């Protein structure tokens with residue numbers, strides 16, 4: 381859909397049959413989700429915004445469902461205040477910014 | 480434009496004769512610029528990124544130009560790595576997320 385920015389662009393995502401609320405974020409290189417167990421090998425990583433960096437676990441080739449759109453790619457898991465769909469996944473659903 | 484997210488959505492902003500590079504950021508409630516002097520009164524705010532909070536100075540009714548779109552609103556100044564155009568000014572240019 382075409383979506384407004386008068387409110388935060390929160391959408392429902394599906395991961396491992398977990399239902400979660402996540403932010404569509406054009407200012408995020410990566411996708412970062414709050415703490416959750418995902419199966420498989422992961423590598424340690426740090427990511428940062430304002431305020432400093434956080435340590436996360438990097439899971440590759442994770443399926444996610446974003447508003448009826450089934451993508452698979454890299455998911456970071458760690459102490460993020462909120463679930464964040466960054467450009468790696470936004471790209472996979474043909475999401476653009478428009479004005 | 481219809482901006483793909485295959486790269487970071489970096490654009491030119493003009494603020495008081497200063498040209499700057501800034502990131503179109505749907506994950507940001509607020510617009511946050513790196514350290515600069517701005518005219519007028521200001522209030523301290525605290526804003527929260529991924530790593531925690533920073534203190535900024537809030538300037539109200541600051542004219543800003545985004546891709547030659549003339550906009551006026553709240554601009555926060557402080558220790559950000561990158562000039563961030565948040566939703567307060569993205570809504571002013573009629574910006575939507577499309578997928």
Ligand SMILES: COC(=O)N[C@H](C(=O)N[C@@H](Cc1ccccc1)[C@@H](O)CN(Cc1ccc(-c2ccccn2)cc1)NC(=O)[C@@H](NC(=O)OC)C(C)(C)C)C(C)(C)C
Pocket residue numbers: 405406407408409410411412427428429430461462464466504505506507508509510511526527528529560561563565
């Ligand atoms: C290359 O680095 C990045 O891309 N960093 C990303 C990042 O932090 N992006 C920032 C912008 C940014 C880019 C590059 C360097 C530094 C910062 C934002 O897109 C997402 N970010 C991360 C973030 C987003 C939301 C929230 C949040 C908190 C409480 C409730 C809802 N959301 C917290 C952190 N948002 C905020 O930090 C904003 N915060 C905000 O809008 O808070 C209400 C600010 C900006 C206004 C402070 C991620 C770690 C998410 C991948």
